[PDB]
RNA sequence: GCUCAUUAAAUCAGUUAUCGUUUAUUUGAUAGUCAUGGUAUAACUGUGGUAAUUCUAGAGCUAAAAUCUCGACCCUUUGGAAGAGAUGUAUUUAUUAGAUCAAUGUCUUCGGACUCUUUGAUGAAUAACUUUUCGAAUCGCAUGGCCUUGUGCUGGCGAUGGUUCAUUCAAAUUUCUGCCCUAUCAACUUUCGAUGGUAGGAUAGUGGCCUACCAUGGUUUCAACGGGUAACGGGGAAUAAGGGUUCGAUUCCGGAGAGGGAGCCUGAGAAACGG
């Protein structure tokens, strides 16, 4: 419970730091490659 | 049970119907007839199931435990027998053909794009024939072009435009896969956009636009089509 | 029990009613869900498994726009005065699409004073709508189909939209 | 004039008249894109989309308002008779108020989310 | 009632119902429906709705005003974590606008009673209650958010009492500045909250200036409000507001727009003007931020102050006008229109009237003449013409600077297209000739421009133009007067654009022949080449102008001019290398007998003369077939680069123009006929 | 699943589009702005009735925020650093959009002015609401960063839960073609709209499908409409029959219904013989 509230608050920010950084990661791949065109 | 399965009439009354998946059902193929009926590799469906559960085979980089996964054009099949790697290919004589590929050409897969559309939050995407969706594509690709997929990510390594002069394999229609794969393109009444193909035996014959499969260049194409 | 099926009709030649099927679940021509004004009532209708249509049976307010500045507030309904495709629909006071219905757009006036600060002669708009802010009975159409939306939406009529419609009023 | 009914019409367009490119090698006449008729069922500056099947044929009837009848025909080869025999099947198509279409008048037609139970095609180019 | 708990709200509603009041007993259903969260929007639309059904009485709503406001503020004080709670907050903001004016003052004082502003009002500017509690910050943020909600609903109706609304907002603004002054690096959450408090307070203050305008007399507390502005913001205000038009910048811009608050900027000791000018003079400023400064100076110019230090504000604007000369070149269409209008307003005031100011204005007019007015509107071109006329109205005149200005004016007169703007430019040149000392050719060109403008005004001056053309034919205008002939070249090009029977075209050819004879008489390598280069610049563009035009009279006049110019001048080495030359049946026979059959190198002379006639024959049947044979002779008489340019012109016209594709291909095949013959000869 | 049923482009075979639609299931992408204060339903005994049902009533007890032309810039790009930057979809209507350059050029006064098929790169979002979402509900492993030394703010894989698109089997209409004797039936359709226009309702959706008000039209001697078919006959539907002349055999096949009309019901499936 308290241990489960540890893993809940850990994972809720873990996919936040994973996906939304990856959201900007291929966004900058678009930005570098649009400058190529 | 049609003839592109390349299965004998003996040993089976009800052919295994393919399940729902990333391909049209007519050129679909379950992995059970790929192993125990064309590779002659298993003997019963129960060990075909045991092949899938013990995860020594995989398709397109995913383990994909299903008896009736439909298999499309030149899918990458990964097996663990002397680290061998397999790819399908189409034959002129109305059948299927799988052959050994090494791992460098197994890393990519050259696939035709189906449609292109601007998506959510203003981003563009593109879809292929195998259901794989690639976003932020090349803006210079059009309908009936092709793309290489990474097999680790879904992005682009290589791409060529549809044109008149380069190797554009044929798939579907009254014909099914003649080697030589190019003359040119023109229009027609009713739609049904005319694509002509000239073989190595130098005969020209017309097809449709949905059968476009740009496989490479004269000399070197990107696919490892074997020797007959 | 209404039919939306295509084979009930006559052919281009006028073929004589070949009588192939009877009615199934798929061509279920639903009832005409005519509404009225009053306290808001909602019906949820399940079609095609997971599509939830919203039948608006009674409705009292709507989201009507004013295109000259592009704004829309919530306005209390008053009553329909004209419909193009029907006349007894007006006497029934049932609000379908494109029906010309009165409102008392007091918060439109309240927004106008909160954006300009000048009274309405008791940057500018044309004179034919100054005839009825004093009356407080502003005309508006219906934009969305209320029978499946479960919502009432429209816009205020604008310039020539009056000058063609009070011509059709009289 | 254009206003001839009990309701004003204007397409929502998903410049005051949004040009829409057909594809399939087509371009608007200048009368259509600077017209005044609204006509949301017309394939240009309207919600309907032109795509798919195309056909060309000769107008045979233009007697009434905003749809016309096209005679398309072929010297149809009956195999047992070894004879090309002309057969016409006059299909009715919609006509937009951008092309002053009379009988004769070779044109091109294509499918336009078919309108009323026999109108399956729509004019896109005159000649 | 002020608590955010719903059970406390229901307990207070039971306390309100227990109070002896018959109107509240009549409105007991209204209190229960407002307490019910499921009927929260329904109670506003029925019980709280005025000018409709189920409205309260006049005496009943006046007595129950504080109870209704405390319930509404308690609904507002609930946190909007949920979407329904956020929609309840928006409905609470919307329902407050239709109650009353004094009830809105009571609800604002109720929010002010929740906060604390007596200690800050008692002190001059110090935060005496030095408590940096986040709860004190959150209470100030809630009152700021409620005021922002109130300003959003009632943007021209939200009244503001000075002691109630303005004093607590200033106290919240001063607390945020005191929090930022005490902002250590440890309390990151408190520093971030005060930053949002400063951002919300500045937007609320900008909205308050936007809401009041000329309504609320804000001049009573304007001294303390600007004291809060000068301390927290004006430390590095010019060094900060440079990304876009800032909240303090828009507050200064609205203070610039309002004449009463313009005196409030004048109440400050020119600190706002010095900050605005230095932000305008920033090294890496943005165009959108600078554009607000230009509009603010235009409002200051259009509305001069009738008070103290107004000339000091005018002198600060004139010093900003000195910085505005290096500006207006690092910037859309509206920015060009605003920069032109600000320069026109500065010239209308005439504050920069010094000789060194006019020297910088001459440099500014040099950059203005450098900027071509093709993209700009004709009114902006007329405004630039009026601004230069204002500089011409100033007596600051030179010789070398006037000569560079006359060269730009002659380029402007040749490129002039508007009838009114060319009339103003000719009047500007008439003013320029009178203003610039030792400008007699400018005065002569002013007489030439006056006859040109009178010819545009009426057709009777066409005989006066012909007499002036006869006078210039009798001239006498040598290479020294080629600057006057440059205005004559612009006038001839203006006549070339028109169709006045080519009388000026033949007279300018006679004037060029007289000028070439004087240039041939003057054997100096500088002045004769300068007249030749002026002739080469004015004829070769006119040859290309005559190439595109269908005026055969212009082409025949150019043919007679080029016959005499090749015979007399013949100066260039490239012209000497190309000097291999000197109805339809006569044109075909002359083309076959020309030097194209006698030369293989003269590409430039053949292309500049015969290719326009070949294109004219391409548009006009037998002549086109004869031109194709003439093109083949010209292709054998051309160079490698010129043949590729003609082929690229032929190939691109074949793809684009569907007029004559086969004729262009036949011309390409005739061009390929000499190319294949030369390729086999090389092989 | 069972028995009775032939209407001759009718089913059916497909040449095709569904940017006009639906989709549980198949894949591929896909977000963010008090360790239950709280209701859990859950059963149980304990007497009864009724001829009688899986008939039944009543009683008690279960520091939730990162991003920026980025910047005043400094002192280096390992950079950091003032702060007008503001940053959830779902429905459901509106308002605003969704070119020129470095030129392999002619030409130049040998700088570089005349800069798309003259190197080459190609333009043509939101203000409101609704009977939103509360914006990882779970889980197996690990037993970490370091003092906030507390049963701590912690993550490496979290397999798997959701949101919206494309694909997929599922059909819905529909494009054309593929059939039999016939003109000793020449006109038929409005004699259930017959043909279009627009609007509205309904539909998952185009739709005369239906309704409203208009205009009167549409298909034909190239045969519209009409008489014949155990259409147990057709369909390459299907291997073959290693010679039973052309098939011995394989299957699709024409529908309605669960005593009979009438209406309703849930499911991505259906007017169910599982109400």
PDB file of C-alpha atoms in Angstrom, chain E residues 64-257:
ATOM      1  CA  UNK E  64     -29.715  38.500   1.066  1.00  0.00           C
ATOM      2  CA  UNK E  65     -26.862  40.008  -0.979  1.00  0.00           C
ATOM      3  CA  UNK E  66     -24.097  39.046   1.508  1.00  0.00           C
ATOM      4  CA  UNK E  67     -25.441  35.515   1.990  1.00  0.00           C
ATOM      5  CA  UNK E  68     -25.653  34.966  -1.776  1.00  0.00           C
ATOM      6  CA  UNK E  69     -22.169  36.425  -2.255  1.00  0.00           C
ATOM      7  CA  UNK E  70     -20.629  34.303   0.514  1.00  0.00           C
ATOM      8  CA  UNK E  71     -22.105  31.146  -1.013  1.00  0.00           C
ATOM      9  CA  UNK E  72     -20.891  32.197  -4.469  1.00  0.00           C
ATOM     10  CA  UNK E  73     -17.415  33.064  -3.169  1.00  0.00           C
ATOM     11  CA  UNK E  74     -17.340  29.760  -1.295  1.00  0.00           C
ATOM     12  CA  UNK E  75     -18.051  28.015  -4.587  1.00  0.00           C
ATOM     13  CA  UNK E  76     -15.266  30.116  -6.109  1.00  0.00           C
ATOM     14  CA  UNK E  77     -12.922  29.312  -3.208  1.00  0.00           C
ATOM     15  CA  UNK E  78     -13.252  25.572  -3.926  1.00  0.00           C
ATOM     16  CA  UNK E  79     -10.150  24.271  -5.762  1.00  0.00           C
ATOM     17  CA  UNK E  80     -10.681  23.572  -9.484  1.00  0.00           C
ATOM     18  CA  UNK E  81      -8.887  20.224  -9.595  1.00  0.00           C
ATOM     19  CA  UNK E  82     -11.782  18.490 -11.372  1.00  0.00           C
ATOM     20  CA  UNK E  83     -13.288  19.481 -14.699  1.00  0.00           C
ATOM     21  CA  UNK E  84     -16.700  19.974 -13.100  1.00  0.00           C
ATOM     22  CA  UNK E  85     -15.029  22.112 -10.427  1.00  0.00           C
ATOM     23  CA  UNK E  86     -13.353  24.149 -13.176  1.00  0.00           C
ATOM     24  CA  UNK E  87     -16.697  24.603 -14.946  1.00  0.00           C
ATOM     25  CA  UNK E  88     -18.270  25.591 -11.621  1.00  0.00           C
ATOM     26  CA  UNK E  89     -15.600  28.282 -11.240  1.00  0.00           C
ATOM     27  CA  UNK E  90     -16.357  29.604 -14.735  1.00  0.00           C
ATOM     28  CA  UNK E  91     -20.086  29.608 -13.970  1.00  0.00           C
ATOM     29  CA  UNK E  92     -19.384  31.460 -10.714  1.00  0.00           C
ATOM     30  CA  UNK E  93     -17.440  34.065 -12.698  1.00  0.00           C
ATOM     31  CA  UNK E  94     -20.229  34.409 -15.271  1.00  0.00           C
ATOM     32  CA  UNK E  95     -23.070  34.663 -12.741  1.00  0.00           C
ATOM     33  CA  UNK E  96     -21.324  37.479 -10.826  1.00  0.00           C
ATOM     34  CA  UNK E  97     -21.579  39.813 -13.847  1.00  0.00           C
ATOM     35  CA  UNK E  98     -25.396  40.020 -13.892  1.00  0.00           C
ATOM     36  CA  UNK E  99     -26.111  40.682 -10.204  1.00  0.00           C
ATOM     37  CA  UNK E 100     -25.472  44.415  -9.565  1.00  0.00           C
ATOM     38  CA  UNK E 101     -22.714  47.019  -9.569  1.00  0.00           C
ATOM     39  CA  UNK E 102     -22.613  47.598  -5.788  1.00  0.00           C
ATOM     40  CA  UNK E 103     -23.025  43.869  -5.127  1.00  0.00           C
ATOM     41  CA  UNK E 104     -19.952  43.344  -7.309  1.00  0.00           C
ATOM     42  CA  UNK E 105     -18.235  45.905  -5.077  1.00  0.00           C
ATOM     43  CA  UNK E 106     -19.375  43.925  -2.029  1.00  0.00           C
ATOM     44  CA  UNK E 107     -18.111  40.639  -3.489  1.00  0.00           C
ATOM     45  CA  UNK E 108     -14.781  42.269  -4.349  1.00  0.00           C
ATOM     46  CA  UNK E 109     -14.573  43.644  -0.805  1.00  0.00           C
ATOM     47  CA  UNK E 110     -15.416  40.142   0.436  1.00  0.00           C
ATOM     48  CA  UNK E 111     -12.395  38.817  -1.460  1.00  0.00           C
ATOM     49  CA  UNK E 112     -10.395  41.746  -0.078  1.00  0.00           C
ATOM     50  CA  UNK E 113     -11.591  40.807   3.415  1.00  0.00           C
ATOM     51  CA  UNK E 114     -10.136  37.341   2.787  1.00  0.00           C
ATOM     52  CA  UNK E 115      -6.779  38.971   2.012  1.00  0.00           C
ATOM     53  CA  UNK E 116      -4.885  41.584   4.033  1.00  0.00           C
ATOM     54  CA  UNK E 117      -3.861  45.047   2.826  1.00  0.00           C
ATOM     55  CA  UNK E 118      -4.056  47.347   5.872  1.00  0.00           C
ATOM     56  CA  UNK E 119      -0.397  46.865   6.834  1.00  0.00           C
ATOM     57  CA  UNK E 120       0.869  47.566   3.310  1.00  0.00           C
ATOM     58  CA  UNK E 121      -1.362  50.639   2.991  1.00  0.00           C
ATOM     59  CA  UNK E 122      -0.154  51.907   6.366  1.00  0.00           C
ATOM     60  CA  UNK E 123       3.485  51.621   5.332  1.00  0.00           C
ATOM     61  CA  UNK E 124       4.756  53.842   2.531  1.00  0.00           C
ATOM     62  CA  UNK E 125       6.348  51.116   0.409  1.00  0.00           C
ATOM     63  CA  UNK E 126       7.880  48.663   2.898  1.00  0.00           C
ATOM     64  CA  UNK E 127       6.642  45.137   3.617  1.00  0.00           C
ATOM     65  CA  UNK E 128       6.429  45.692   7.368  1.00  0.00           C
ATOM     66  CA  UNK E 129       4.747  42.331   8.029  1.00  0.00           C
ATOM     67  CA  UNK E 130       7.780  40.462   6.690  1.00  0.00           C
ATOM     68  CA  UNK E 131       6.094  37.068   6.399  1.00  0.00           C
ATOM     69  CA  UNK E 132       7.008  35.005   3.327  1.00  0.00           C
ATOM     70  CA  UNK E 133       4.400  32.308   3.957  1.00  0.00           C
ATOM     71  CA  UNK E 134       3.205  30.396   0.904  1.00  0.00           C
ATOM     72  CA  UNK E 135      -0.310  30.512   2.368  1.00  0.00           C
ATOM     73  CA  UNK E 136      -0.015  34.304   2.302  1.00  0.00           C
ATOM     74  CA  UNK E 137       1.231  33.945  -1.278  1.00  0.00           C
ATOM     75  CA  UNK E 138      -1.613  31.572  -2.198  1.00  0.00           C
ATOM     76  CA  UNK E 139      -4.253  33.876  -0.705  1.00  0.00           C
ATOM     77  CA  UNK E 140      -2.825  36.763  -2.735  1.00  0.00           C
ATOM     78  CA  UNK E 141      -2.798  34.551  -5.835  1.00  0.00           C
ATOM     79  CA  UNK E 142      -6.429  33.577  -5.268  1.00  0.00           C
ATOM     80  CA  UNK E 143      -7.544  37.201  -5.032  1.00  0.00           C
ATOM     81  CA  UNK E 144      -5.502  37.932  -8.160  1.00  0.00           C
ATOM     82  CA  UNK E 145      -7.111  35.002  -9.990  1.00  0.00           C
ATOM     83  CA  UNK E 146     -10.584  36.101  -8.872  1.00  0.00           C
ATOM     84  CA  UNK E 147      -9.885  39.657 -10.049  1.00  0.00           C
ATOM     85  CA  UNK E 148      -8.606  38.228 -13.339  1.00  0.00           C
ATOM     86  CA  UNK E 149     -11.848  36.255 -13.572  1.00  0.00           C
ATOM     87  CA  UNK E 150     -13.794  39.423 -12.734  1.00  0.00           C
ATOM     88  CA  UNK E 151     -11.882  41.443 -15.334  1.00  0.00           C
ATOM     89  CA  UNK E 152     -12.499  38.716 -17.920  1.00  0.00           C
ATOM     90  CA  UNK E 153     -16.283  38.853 -17.510  1.00  0.00           C
ATOM     91  CA  UNK E 154     -16.679  42.622 -17.062  1.00  0.00           C
ATOM     92  CA  UNK E 155     -13.861  44.053 -19.195  1.00  0.00           C
ATOM     93  CA  UNK E 156     -15.743  47.356 -19.614  1.00  0.00           C
ATOM     94  CA  UNK E 157     -17.960  47.075 -16.526  1.00  0.00           C
ATOM     95  CA  UNK E 158     -15.849  45.911 -13.554  1.00  0.00           C
ATOM     96  CA  UNK E 159     -15.684  48.864 -11.142  1.00  0.00           C
ATOM     97  CA  UNK E 160     -12.743  49.153  -8.773  1.00  0.00           C
ATOM     98  CA  UNK E 161     -12.803  51.024  -5.476  1.00  0.00           C
ATOM     99  CA  UNK E 162      -9.448  52.574  -4.599  1.00  0.00           C
ATOM    100  CA  UNK E 163      -9.273  51.416  -0.978  1.00  0.00           C
ATOM    101  CA  UNK E 164     -10.939  48.068  -1.704  1.00  0.00           C
ATOM    102  CA  UNK E 165      -9.836  46.842  -5.130  1.00  0.00           C
ATOM    103  CA  UNK E 166      -6.875  49.049  -6.045  1.00  0.00           C
ATOM    104  CA  UNK E 167      -5.203  49.052  -2.620  1.00  0.00           C
ATOM    105  CA  UNK E 168      -5.225  45.235  -2.192  1.00  0.00           C
ATOM    106  CA  UNK E 169      -4.075  44.711  -5.784  1.00  0.00           C
ATOM    107  CA  UNK E 170      -1.196  47.135  -5.217  1.00  0.00           C
ATOM    108  CA  UNK E 171      -0.476  45.404  -1.900  1.00  0.00           C
ATOM    109  CA  UNK E 172      -0.436  42.060  -3.715  1.00  0.00           C
ATOM    110  CA  UNK E 173       1.837  43.616  -6.347  1.00  0.00           C
ATOM    111  CA  UNK E 174       4.134  45.035  -3.662  1.00  0.00           C
ATOM    112  CA  UNK E 175       4.199  41.686  -1.843  1.00  0.00           C
ATOM    113  CA  UNK E 176       5.290  39.936  -5.048  1.00  0.00           C
ATOM    114  CA  UNK E 177       8.085  42.478  -5.527  1.00  0.00           C
ATOM    115  CA  UNK E 178       9.060  42.006  -1.876  1.00  0.00           C
ATOM    116  CA  UNK E 179       8.970  38.226  -2.351  1.00  0.00           C
ATOM    117  CA  UNK E 180      11.225  38.523  -5.404  1.00  0.00           C
ATOM    118  CA  UNK E 181      13.511  40.851  -3.437  1.00  0.00           C
ATOM    119  CA  UNK E 182      13.670  38.250  -0.648  1.00  0.00           C
ATOM    120  CA  UNK E 183      13.789  35.324  -3.115  1.00  0.00           C
ATOM    121  CA  UNK E 184      16.643  33.098  -2.010  1.00  0.00           C
ATOM    122  CA  UNK E 185      17.721  30.077  -4.037  1.00  0.00           C
ATOM    123  CA  UNK E 186      16.423  27.649  -1.392  1.00  0.00           C
ATOM    124  CA  UNK E 187      12.656  28.250  -1.620  1.00  0.00           C
ATOM    125  CA  UNK E 188      12.285  27.229  -5.259  1.00  0.00           C
ATOM    126  CA  UNK E 189       8.535  26.633  -4.928  1.00  0.00           C
ATOM    127  CA  UNK E 190       8.052  30.021  -3.255  1.00  0.00           C
ATOM    128  CA  UNK E 191      10.168  31.719  -5.930  1.00  0.00           C
ATOM    129  CA  UNK E 192       8.160  30.024  -8.685  1.00  0.00           C
ATOM    130  CA  UNK E 193       4.844  30.927  -7.033  1.00  0.00           C
ATOM    131  CA  UNK E 194       5.817  34.594  -6.692  1.00  0.00           C
ATOM    132  CA  UNK E 195       6.913  34.581 -10.342  1.00  0.00           C
ATOM    133  CA  UNK E 196       3.422  33.415 -11.294  1.00  0.00           C
ATOM    134  CA  UNK E 197       2.066  35.990  -8.837  1.00  0.00           C
ATOM    135  CA  UNK E 198       4.089  38.714 -10.568  1.00  0.00           C
ATOM    136  CA  UNK E 199       2.943  37.449 -13.974  1.00  0.00           C
ATOM    137  CA  UNK E 200      -0.707  37.363 -12.898  1.00  0.00           C
ATOM    138  CA  UNK E 201      -0.449  40.742 -11.172  1.00  0.00           C
ATOM    139  CA  UNK E 202       1.067  42.446 -14.216  1.00  0.00           C
ATOM    140  CA  UNK E 203      -1.644  41.015 -16.473  1.00  0.00           C
ATOM    141  CA  UNK E 204      -4.293  42.103 -13.965  1.00  0.00           C
ATOM    142  CA  UNK E 205      -2.761  45.587 -13.807  1.00  0.00           C
ATOM    143  CA  UNK E 206      -2.627  45.753 -17.610  1.00  0.00           C
ATOM    144  CA  UNK E 207      -6.247  44.602 -17.775  1.00  0.00           C
ATOM    145  CA  UNK E 208      -7.183  47.200 -15.139  1.00  0.00           C
ATOM    146  CA  UNK E 209      -5.676  49.922 -17.322  1.00  0.00           C
ATOM    147  CA  UNK E 210      -7.468  48.278 -20.249  1.00  0.00           C
ATOM    148  CA  UNK E 211     -10.760  48.159 -18.335  1.00  0.00           C
ATOM    149  CA  UNK E 212     -10.650  51.693 -16.915  1.00  0.00           C
ATOM    150  CA  UNK E 213      -9.107  53.763 -19.694  1.00  0.00           C
ATOM    151  CA  UNK E 214     -10.827  57.128 -19.300  1.00  0.00           C
ATOM    152  CA  UNK E 215     -13.463  55.871 -16.844  1.00  0.00           C
ATOM    153  CA  UNK E 216     -11.730  55.464 -13.479  1.00  0.00           C
ATOM    154  CA  UNK E 217      -9.824  58.452 -12.112  1.00  0.00           C
ATOM    155  CA  UNK E 218      -6.582  56.570 -11.441  1.00  0.00           C
ATOM    156  CA  UNK E 219      -4.481  59.745 -11.095  1.00  0.00           C
ATOM    157  CA  UNK E 220      -5.008  59.934  -7.313  1.00  0.00           C
ATOM    158  CA  UNK E 221      -3.054  56.730  -6.618  1.00  0.00           C
ATOM    159  CA  UNK E 222      -0.940  56.941  -9.791  1.00  0.00           C
ATOM    160  CA  UNK E 223       2.069  58.211  -7.819  1.00  0.00           C
ATOM    161  CA  UNK E 224       2.205  55.151  -5.557  1.00  0.00           C
ATOM    162  CA  UNK E 225       1.354  52.808  -8.442  1.00  0.00           C
ATOM    163  CA  UNK E 226       4.213  54.168 -10.557  1.00  0.00           C
ATOM    164  CA  UNK E 227       6.449  53.980  -7.475  1.00  0.00           C
ATOM    165  CA  UNK E 228       5.712  50.251  -7.374  1.00  0.00           C
ATOM    166  CA  UNK E 229       6.389  50.173 -11.127  1.00  0.00           C
ATOM    167  CA  UNK E 230       9.659  52.131 -10.907  1.00  0.00           C
ATOM    168  CA  UNK E 231      11.115  50.061  -8.055  1.00  0.00           C
ATOM    169  CA  UNK E 232      10.341  46.481  -9.194  1.00  0.00           C
ATOM    170  CA  UNK E 233      10.376  46.830 -12.980  1.00  0.00           C
ATOM    171  CA  UNK E 234      12.353  49.918 -14.058  1.00  0.00           C
ATOM    172  CA  UNK E 235      15.703  48.646 -12.738  1.00  0.00           C
ATOM    173  CA  UNK E 236      16.461  46.907 -16.050  1.00  0.00           C
ATOM    174  CA  UNK E 237      13.207  47.523 -17.935  1.00  0.00           C
ATOM    175  CA  UNK E 238      14.910  48.412 -21.221  1.00  0.00           C
ATOM    176  CA  UNK E 239      17.227  45.412 -20.830  1.00  0.00           C
ATOM    177  CA  UNK E 240      14.310  43.039 -20.139  1.00  0.00           C
ATOM    178  CA  UNK E 241      11.343  43.714 -22.440  1.00  0.00           C
ATOM    179  CA  UNK E 242      12.807  42.599 -25.772  1.00  0.00           C
ATOM    180  CA  UNK E 243      11.108  39.330 -26.796  1.00  0.00           C
ATOM    181  CA  UNK E 244       7.633  40.737 -27.558  1.00  0.00           C
ATOM    182  CA  UNK E 245       5.328  43.555 -26.339  1.00  0.00           C
ATOM    183  CA  UNK E 246       5.591  43.108 -22.586  1.00  0.00           C
ATOM    184  CA  UNK E 247       2.952  43.526 -19.885  1.00  0.00           C
ATOM    185  CA  UNK E 248       4.748  46.556 -18.465  1.00  0.00           C
ATOM    186  CA  UNK E 249       5.387  47.678 -22.049  1.00  0.00           C
ATOM    187  CA  UNK E 250       1.686  47.369 -22.897  1.00  0.00           C
ATOM    188  CA  UNK E 251       0.962  49.165 -19.624  1.00  0.00           C
ATOM    189  CA  UNK E 252       3.322  51.887 -20.835  1.00  0.00           C
ATOM    190  CA  UNK E 253       1.746  51.707 -24.303  1.00  0.00           C
ATOM    191  CA  UNK E 254      -1.741  52.119 -22.835  1.00  0.00           C
ATOM    192  CA  UNK E 255      -0.324  54.925 -20.694  1.00  0.00           C
ATOM    193  CA  UNK E 256       0.994  56.411 -23.936  1.00  0.00           C
ATOM    194  CA  UNK E 257      -2.427  55.992 -25.559  1.00  0.00           C
TER     195      UNK E 257
END
